[PDB]
Amino acid sequence: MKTKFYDYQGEHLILYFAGWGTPPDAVNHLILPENHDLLICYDYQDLNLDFDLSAYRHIRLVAWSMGVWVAERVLQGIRLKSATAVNGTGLPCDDSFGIPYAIFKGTLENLTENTRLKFERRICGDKASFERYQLFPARPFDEIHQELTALFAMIQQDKRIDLIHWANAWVSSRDKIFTPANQHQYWALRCAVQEIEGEHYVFSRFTHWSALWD
């Protein structure tokens, strides 16, 4: 996969796993706590993370949407100080715990540049939110089509759960991708759930990374 590394010479690391096809800049505005680096992970063509995690003390994981399922694969076995899910579950292609199968299939089979914009509208909910989101650099279409293809295959092949331990999960009240009912159903007995009013993209309600985990 791809990475963007922000080097603050920190002893600790923030690991952020993006949603499918989403711009890394979606979290650009978030302020880091002192003594922390940030590594943005995205473009899940594969599950390979070419980054040395070995020298860091604490690692704070934040994962959005399909990034949750991915993070469970990539960080299985790695000691994390905390792991935070944001609008995503361990079962991302699931009628009851994630995105329903027919929707996952239909999104991929009908993906064009036009329908990509339609999906982003649903990520954002309202027009105002959508128009602000469109100020972010758009990743190339061929890249995100290849990414959804690999994700849909791997998720179908690999239905394991609880590969890492989650400390908390944020659930948006009006999430149209991972519905709140499906999120609550997955996280209820796993971790602490913070309910927030908003949509699938909810990082415009945050100014500081640390507010996501504390």
UniProtKB/Swiss-Prot annotation:
Pfam families, per database record: BioG
Taxonomy, superkingdom: Bacteria
InterPro entries hit by this protein: BioG
Protein name: Uncharacterized protein HI_1552
Organism: Haemophilus influenzae (strain ATCC 51907 / DSM 11121 / KW20 / Rd)
